[PDB]
Amino acid sequence: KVFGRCELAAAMKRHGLDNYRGYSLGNWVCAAKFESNFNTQATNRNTDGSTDYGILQINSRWWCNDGRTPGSRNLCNIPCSALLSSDITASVNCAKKIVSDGNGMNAWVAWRNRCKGTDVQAWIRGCRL
Amino acid sequence: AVYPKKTHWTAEITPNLHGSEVVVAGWVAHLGDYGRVKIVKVSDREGGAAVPVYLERGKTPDHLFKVFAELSREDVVVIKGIVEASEQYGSATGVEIFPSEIWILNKA
């Protein structure tokens, strides 16, 4: 599914991401935009044998299990397939574990590269939350 | 061949060093592998700084990812890289190191 911006903001807010580990909701929306273009089915294989899955591009080495990445730790205890659905619950539960690992949202390269130090709250402007 | 000499204690790595090459030496306090970003935090004093050394696909030389993969918490390492002043999660310290070399002195 491809989410609308406000539609994803509302869904992230209902899932408790606004100010989760001190990150305001537009951080999460901006991260999804640059990680997946709001597309829940986004799947991207890396040269290292791992693949990133879903709206927040969660990686298969440590975080979810895709059954095909060596050294898989599955810290979110979830198959990567769960991260590809129309519903963001699994991606959110897993993003909360990742953002709590001790580096905040620096775990997402597209958040570092496109969101950090920018007007992140612009991402929720005009949304009726 | 032969690891380089420490130029700075981890506590001396401050935003005012932005753009400078440094060598830090100490133990692996924390490892995070998030796929395209991997972060090794290095400390050299108990109850001290844990300076994050950031590996990013597209930016860090590939060979350093192979070295990251050999790392374990408490390994003793020596890292050469460039200081970057930037906001860190849960710290007022505001620095990271983009590595050009990672040496593993020994495997705790």
Author numbering:
A (entry chain A): 1 to 129
B (entry chain B): 0 to 107
Publication text:
In this study we have designed and tested the properties of a new protein scaffold based on the OB-fold of the aspartyl tRNA synthetase (AspRS) from the thermophile Pyrobaculum aerophilum. We term these small, single-domain engineered binding proteins OBodies. To demonstrate the amenability of this new scaffold to engineering for new binding specificity, we developed a series of OBodies with increasing affinity to a model target protein, hen egg-white lysozyme (HEL). Sharing a common range of epitopes centred on the HEL active site, these OBodies were also found to be efficient inhibitors of HEL activity.
For the second phase of affinity maturation, AM1L200 was used as the template for an EP-PCR library, selections from which produced variant AM2EP06 (KD = 250 nM), representing a 4-fold improvement in affinity over AM1L200. The crystal structure of AM2EP06 was solved in complex with HEL to a resolution of 1.86 Å. With three amino acid substitutions compared to the parent AM1L200 (T19S, M37K and K86E), it showed a binding face that was very similar to AM1L10 and NL8, with differences at the periphery. In a manner very similar to the AM1L10 structure, a small conformational change in R61 from HEL moved its guanidinyl group away from the interface. In contrast to the previous two HEL-complex structures, L4, with an entirely new sequence, was moderately well-defined as electron density in the structure. The loop showed some contact with HEL, increasing buried surface area by ∼100 Å2, although no additional hydrogen bonds or other polar contacts were noted. The L4 residues from AM2EP06 also made extensive contacts with the β-sheet binding face via S85 and Q87, potentially introducing conformational restraints to HEL-binding residues. Similarly, at the C-terminal end of L4 an intrachain hydrogen bond between S90 and T92 also restrained the loop. In this case the exact molecular determinants of the improvement in affinity were less clear, but the most likely explanation seemed to be a change in L4 dynamics through the K86E substitution. Although some role in long-range electrostatic attraction may be hypothesised, we think it most likely that this mutation increased the occupation of binding-favourable conformations of L4 by removing competing interactions with HEL.
